[PDB]
Amino acid sequence: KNGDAKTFWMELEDDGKVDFIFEQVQNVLQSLKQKIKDGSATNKEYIQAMILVNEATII
């Protein structure tokens, strides 16, 4: 099929995994948020959360 990002997402839907993958992303974000508010986040988790925020939203 087409060589683009849409093709992957249509394959993923045919695989029945779209809700699943978004749930995993949502679980990771929740975990990062809790660790940051708790003060237990590692350096790599602070970095990961910063990068995710900046990819989703302006600043």
Contact residues: its own copies, CB under 8 A: 4-6, 8-9, 13, 18-19, 21-22, 24-26, 28-29, 33, 36-37, 41, 43-53, 55-57, 59
Least distance CB 31 / its own copies (angstroms): 10
Q: How far is the CB of 17 from its own copies (least distance, A)?
A: 11
Pairwise CA distance, residues 11 & 3, whole Å: 12
Residue entry with tokens 């995993």: 24
Between 1 and 4, CB nearer to its own copies: 4
3-state DSSP call for residue 29?
Answer: helix
Q: Measuring CA to CA, which residue among 28, 34, 19 is closest to residue 51? A: 28
